[PDB]
Amino acid sequence: PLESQYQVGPLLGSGGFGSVYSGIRVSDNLPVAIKHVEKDRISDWGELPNGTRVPMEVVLLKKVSSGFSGVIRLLDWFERPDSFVLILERPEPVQDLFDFITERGALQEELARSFFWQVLEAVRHCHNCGVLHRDIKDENILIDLNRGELKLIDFGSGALLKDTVYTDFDGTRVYSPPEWIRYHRYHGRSAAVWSLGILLYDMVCGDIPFEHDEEIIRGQVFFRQRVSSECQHLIRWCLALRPSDRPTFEEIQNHPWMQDVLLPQETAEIHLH
């Protein structure tokens, strides 16, 4: 059923998230990724509309599926005796944002603007579908290099979006907000905005702004690269220590730095091709 439907290619990556392989859908040759997660390693469980016990990522990915290409699409999934297997759409050629930044250094602001805008659109889509990602970071963003389109991946640390406090977290610590560090408590949207400020800093500076818990808590941002005043302002706003001082998604997208974004295709033409 699974092994016959897909041609497994090379391992793309493995880590806390499981193991992800390149694959091809045999039926039509569609490029896919094949993600294996061991059952014992599964953090949160959910249940399907028809009531079947699945990894939360499966629940979350089904919730965000539509014609919108900003979130990686779940094509199918399978249960094995000791693991789940997720079939994801795979852009080709593709490069994660982490590698892209590594090789190119800090991104030109025009490019960071286009990329950050697309991430914001993807995250808003998740939130609008009642899904909180909880691990927004450069390693969880794929770049469709031909189309200039970014895709959010890995909902393995995600949760249903709620308006009450979260007291669990298993995303990436250096992207996690000061309230999580200090109090083990955060709200979904304002924690997301914090991680987005970390991400935006990462794009325009070539590295994350904080490494140690103490730096996260202090929230003092130092710019190691030349970054425009308007970009700096937005970053510092996203990284407000008090969650209620952070911009809403609407406020981020209305920020002067965010105006006149390139289209994804223009972005690929100017910056990727």
Q: Which residues are documented as binding site?
A: 12-20, 35, 89, 96
In the list 34, 74, 88, 193, the residue contacting ligand UGX (rule: CB under 6 A) is 88
Number of residues that bind ligand UGX (CB under 6 A): 14
Nearer to ligand UGX, 35 or 63 (CB): 35
In the list 2, 5, 12, 75, the residue contacting ligand UGX (rule: CB under 6 A) is 12
Smallest separation (angstroms) from ligand UGX to the CB of 12: 4
Active-site residue identified among 28, 99, 135, 144: 135
For residues 158 and 132, the answer to whether their CB atoms sit within 8 Å is: yes
Please tell me whether residue 144 binds ligand UGX under the rule CB under 6 A: no
135 included as an active-site residue: yes
| Tokens standing for residue 81 | 């005796």
Smallest separation (angstroms) from ligand UGX to the CB of 137: 10
Nearer to ligand UGX, 90 or 246 (CB): 90
Q: Which residues of 223-259 are buried (b: 16+ CB within 10 A; e: fewer)?
A: eeeebeeebeebbebbbbbebeebbebeebbebebbe
Calpha distance 162→109 (Å, rounded): 33
* H-helix segments, the chain: 2-5, 56-63, 97-104, 109-128, 178-183, 188-205, 213-218, 229-238, 249-253, 264-267
* H-helix segments, 105-187: 109-128, 178-183
In the list 34, 56, 60, 72, the residue contacting ligand UGX (rule: CB under 6 A) is 72
**Catalytic site positions:** 135
Residues near ligand UGX, by CB under 6 A = 12-13, 17, 20, 33, 35, 72, 88, 90, 94, 96, 142, 153-154
